[PDB]
Curated annotation (Swiss-Prot):
Impact reported for residue 104 to D: Normal CO(2) hydrase activity
Domain Alpha-carbonic anhydrase: 1-257
Gene of this entry: CA2
Reported impact of residue 196 to A/C/H/P: Strongly reduced activity
Residues forming the catalytic site: 62 (proton donor/acceptor)
Organism: Homo sapiens
pH dependence as annotated: Optimum pH is 6-8.
Effect of residue 196 to S/V: Reduced activity
Effect of residue 140 to G: Weakly impaired activity
Subcellular location: Cytoplasm; Cell membrane
Name this protein carries in UniProt: Carbonic anhydrase 2
Length: 258
């Protein structure tokens, strides 16, 4: 028995095992576009993914992660509201059972079909494990997905999902270029928050892109074929693995654009 997205172990129950669930800087949150403040001092994001080295893709039960080699500054994020260099360690998605829901963050209460999270850690801390214990330890780039035209750069990911259908399964996943998942514009909103899954640590500087990317109905459909369960167990479709918006509290959302 442990946390999940079901009726008996869902987000509403997490606070019992992880008290920080009711903390002061929890994520996700609803982004009120008319309350966000334009900050002229925010620098443009610097995404350097030309030397990225993907290694594997694994179904860990709550979603699937595409892992990268983070032993050197091969794929890093700098600039924006960040001070220092952040290395990409993995990316994963959150999606729904229907196209009308799936994203964690919302924009003026609007929900998207899914949300992509590219997780990076501050190299000043030596490793991911130490980074999550710091208020400026992680930087997660969030990208919304809407249903429309297919995204070519995402197809390699969707085609391998069959090989990691159940929890615990992993497969070699080399030479995947994450640059194919980025929108044209890098305008963003940023705020201090937390991880959206347990341990829910408040160590994240969120960078949410304004421009969503489009994926086809067929592509998102394949995400919904994954299982929360492990092989040999009752089938439970992996859908709606998103946490609802949390109280903004004493926080301000800044925008890099007018
Ligand atoms: Zn996530």
């Amino acid at each position: 028995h442990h946390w999940g997205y079901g009726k008996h172990n869902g987000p509403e129950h997490w606070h019992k095992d992880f008290p920080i669930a009711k903390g002061e800087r929890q994520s996700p949150v609803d982004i009120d576009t008319h309350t966000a403040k334009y900050d002229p001092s925010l620098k443009p994001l610097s995404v350097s993914y030309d030397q990225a080295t993907s290694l594997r893709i694994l179904n860990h039960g709550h979603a699937f992660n595409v892992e990268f080699d983070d032993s050197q500054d091969k794929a890093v994020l700098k600039g924006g509201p960040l001070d220092g260099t952040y290395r990409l360690i993995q990316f994963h998605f959150h999606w729904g059972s229907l196209d009308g829901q799936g994203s964690e963050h919302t924009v003026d209460k609007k929900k998207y079909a899914a949300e992509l999270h590219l997780v990076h850690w501050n190299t000043k801390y030596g490793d991911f494990g130490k980074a999550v214990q710091q208020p400026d330890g992680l930087a997660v780039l969030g990208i919304f997905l809407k249903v429309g035209s297919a995204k070519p750069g995402l197809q390699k990911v969707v085609d391998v999902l069959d090989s990691i259908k159940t929890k615990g399964k992993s497969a070699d996943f080399t030479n995947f270029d994450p640059r194919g998942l980025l929108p044209e514009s890098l305008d963003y909103w940023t705020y201090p928050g937390s991880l959206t899954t347990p341990p829910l640590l408040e160590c994240v500087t969120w960078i949410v892109l304004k421009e969503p990317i489009s994926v086809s109905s067929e592509q998102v459909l394949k995400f919904r074929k994954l299982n929360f369960n492990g092989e040999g167990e009752p089938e439970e479709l992996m859908v709606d693995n998103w946490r609802p918006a949390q109280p903004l509290k004493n926080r301000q959302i800044k925008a890099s654009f007018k």
